[PDB]
Amino acid sequence: MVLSEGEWQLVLHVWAKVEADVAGHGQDILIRLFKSHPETLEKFDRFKHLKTEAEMKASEDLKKHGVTFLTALGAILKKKGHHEAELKPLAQSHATKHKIPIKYLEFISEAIIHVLHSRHPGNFGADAQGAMNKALELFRKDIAAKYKELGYQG
């Protein structure tokens, strides 16, 4: 698929707001994911033991990983579709080392949309959400194709 420049602009406009607080957004998104789909927490050997949201909020390791994750995602979005180089190392580690099924990429896509909608209602109207969803679907389609080449396709 291909996004129009207009759609990329909507995506990068709300992303510019997200970047004013990378650690906070990273925290919110990971917590939303873990509460909504607890099974995903089991994939993180470092956080697997967290029992409550309060424990999640206080975890320095969780916050640090939220930043690492958001920074990588931001770098991909800023490529506006020309992200092949960025996707390679990411697809290899998630398919072969971490073993993350495509299903889980859809779950985090929902968490991202939920948090942006909660925190940025004025910059995340229906058109902006549609553009963001399209951007994430593009990302998922490409990662899925790479998974297949790598011999996984979760």
- Please give the residue ranges that form the binding site for ligand HEM (CB under 6 A): 40, 43-46, 68-69, 72-73, 90, 93-94, 98, 100, 104-105, 108
Residue pair 50/60 in contact by the 8 Å Cβ criterion: no
Distance CA 137, CA 42 (A): 24
Closer CB to ligand HEM, residue 3 or residue 90?
Answer: 90
Is 114 annotated for ligand binding? no
Cβ contacts of residue 94 below 8 Å, gap of 6+? 100, 143
Closer CB to ligand HEM, residue 34 or residue 124?
Answer: 34
Largest Cα–Cα distance in the chain?
Answer: 43
Which ranges constitute the DSSP H helices of 37-150?
53-58, 60-77, 84-92, 102-119, 126-150
Shortest distance in whole angstroms from residue 93 CB to ligand HEM:
4
Is 25 annotated for ligand binding? no
Closer CB to ligand HEM, residue 64 or residue 122?
Answer: 64
Detail the residues annotated as belonging to a binding site: 65, 94
Residues making up the binding site for heme b: 94
Residue ranges at the known binding site for O2: 65
